[PDB]
A = this chain, B = another copy of it.
Amino acid sequence: KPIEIIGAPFSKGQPRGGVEKGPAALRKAGLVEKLKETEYNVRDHGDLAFVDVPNDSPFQIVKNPRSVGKANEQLAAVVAETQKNGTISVVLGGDHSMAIGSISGHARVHPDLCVIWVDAHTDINTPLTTSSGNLHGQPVAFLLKELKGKFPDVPGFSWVTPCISAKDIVYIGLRDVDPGEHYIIKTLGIKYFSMTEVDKLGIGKVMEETFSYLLGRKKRPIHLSFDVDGLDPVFTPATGTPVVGGLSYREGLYITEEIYKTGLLSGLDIMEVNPTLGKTPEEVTRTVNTAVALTLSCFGTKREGNHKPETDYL
């Protein structure tokens, strides 16, 4: 199977500068080389160059709408391309707002795909409900069909086409949801596993249920959008929005290991890694490393170990 790394050094989805250095950090840690050591063919597409939209006036409360909408239109193009020729796309974030382009592009080639969203936040604020005009917290709002026309069109997002419905997404790791967002998920019947369900069920049963919910009827492509803040700040401290009480390093890998086993992984997002937010070099190293680990886990690396077929080690 082919793998194609796509860097998206973008950061207008939110106020904190740094996330755009995410892809560099993950590469510097040997992500690409370590991936080659797996049974997958790897091709690094490089980092996309995003053209800055001059005079990008805020839309009501939404900030940098055009720059974000354009950077995402570009990314969607690229992702659709690699997806078209049957390769698995792996996007390296900047901020999670790039998930708009990532998933959009993916859905063009695979319209029946489902989304597993490992986050601490639902990122489903609509331009009307956001308290801050930060777009990294509104990705899903622009993707859901059920949210079509429930908020004014935003400058630069006209190209977007709601590709997935409320029945095709499942949240895992939730613990910091705004009143508005909570209203939305309850109202639309979205499936989720907040930290309370994780604590209650254990990470084993949670994964078991997310699959029977999304793959029960039809087996379809899987798009994993992983926000590094879904793990507890103790594991991934170098991010913009820390939230105590999150998934452990162990649980994170267990999610990625189970997803690898389904053989349906089609698209991946490793978002919000911000190298400039580490209080100590070690905090940044901790974060990058676990991000990398999760990525390799998605593509086979098992904790029980791995050995190359047909090779008699004795």
Binding site for B on A (CB under 8 A): 122, 126, 128-129, 150-151, 174-187, 192, 194-204, 207, 244-245, 248-251, 253-254, 257, 289-290, 293, 302-308, 311-314
Contact = CB atoms under 8 A, between A and B. Distances in A.
A179 B304 contact: no
Which of A182, A187, A248, A314 neighbours the largest number of chain B CB atoms within 10 Å of its CB?
A: A314
A305 to B, nearest CB: 3
Contacts of A293: 244
A185 B128 contact: no
Given A179-B305, A179-B313, A204-B201, A250 B245 contact: yes
A305 B182 contact: yes
Given A179-B307, A305-B177, A184 B314 contact: yes
Contact of A305 (B185, B250, B312): B185
A181, A204, A245 — most chain B CB neighbours (10 Å): A245
Contacts of A182: 304-307
Nearest to A247: B250
Given A186-B307, A194-B303, A314 B179 contact: no
A304 B254 contact: no
Given A150-B314, A245-B250, A313-B180, A303 B187 contact: no
Contacts of A312: 183
A149 to B, nearest CB: 10
A254 B180 contact: no
B254 A200 contact: yes
Contact of A177 (B204, B207, B304): B304
A313 B183 contact: yes
Nearest to A199: B254
Residue from A178, A197, A244 with most neighbouring chain B CB atoms (10 Å): A244
Given A179-B307, A245-B248, 14 more contacts: A126-B314, A175-B303, A175-B304, A176-B303, A177-B304, A177-B305, A179-B305, A196-B253, A196-B254, A196-B257, A199-B203, A199-B204, A244-B290, A245-B253
A245 B304 contact: no
Nearest to A200: B204
